[PDB]
Design a protein around this ligand. Structure first.
Ligand SMILES: *[P@@](=O)(OC(C)C)[C@H](C)NC(=O)OCc1ccccc1
Length: 179
């Protein structure tokens, strides 16, 4: 089965997704979004909680599908702590990039997912002995996922190539870890 970190992230996104159906998106964004007013700047969770919010059925399924697989892969083979740190860094840095381009009203785990794509792939090609790698077929689908994000083929946003910032994060870390 999937480790505790993989598991807990899935529960949290589902719970949050439930709340959005009951309360509506705006109300949950009000509590979980990146700070959108100076008085909220010390509410630290907001720099991360944006990743827990999804705006359609397809949004959460596809994110959690990728997370389950790549997140689970990292946790099994590299440990819970690695997954935690990949997650915190990508959520924060992608969050920061998203905010600059699209403002503070955004959500989704895909920044983290792109980071996990970049990380797992790069780590596998540079450190096969680590036990992590992205299979040939999955590389193709991840690439299509990335392209989709660069070009806003998801039907959701139109805020451009910024959606894939996380990928640069994940690559960079995989570099650093392959030393
Ligand atoms: P991601 O959640 O965005 C963050 C804020 C960087 C990404 C752009 N969205 C995504 O991957 O959506 C998946 C999807 C959405 C609708 C239909 C199919 C798949």
């Amino acid at each position: 089965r999937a480790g505790p970190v993989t598991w807990v992230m899935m529960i949290a996104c589902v719970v949050v997704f439930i709340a959005m159906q009951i309360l509506g998106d705006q109300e949950v964004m009000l509590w979980l979004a990146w700070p959108f007013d100076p008085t909220l700047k010390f509410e630290f969770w907001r720099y991360f909680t944006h990743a827990l919010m999804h705006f359609s059925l397809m949004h959460i399924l596809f994110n959690l599908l990728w997370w389950w697989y790549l997140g689970g892969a990292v946790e099994k083979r590299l440990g819970s702590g690695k997954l935690i740190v990949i997650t915190l860094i990508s959520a924060l840095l992608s969050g920061y990039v998203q905010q600059k381009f699209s403002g503070p009203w955004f959500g989704g785990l895909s920044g983290v997912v792109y980071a996990l794509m970049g990380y797992v792939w790069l780590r596998g090609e540079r450190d096969p002995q680590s036990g992590i790698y992205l299979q040939r077929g999955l590389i193709i689908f991840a690439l299509i996922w990335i392209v989709a994000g660069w070009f806003d083929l998801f039907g959701m946003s139109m805020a451009n190539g910024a959606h894939i910032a996380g990928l640069a994060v994940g690559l960079a870390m995989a570099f650093v870890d392959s030393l």
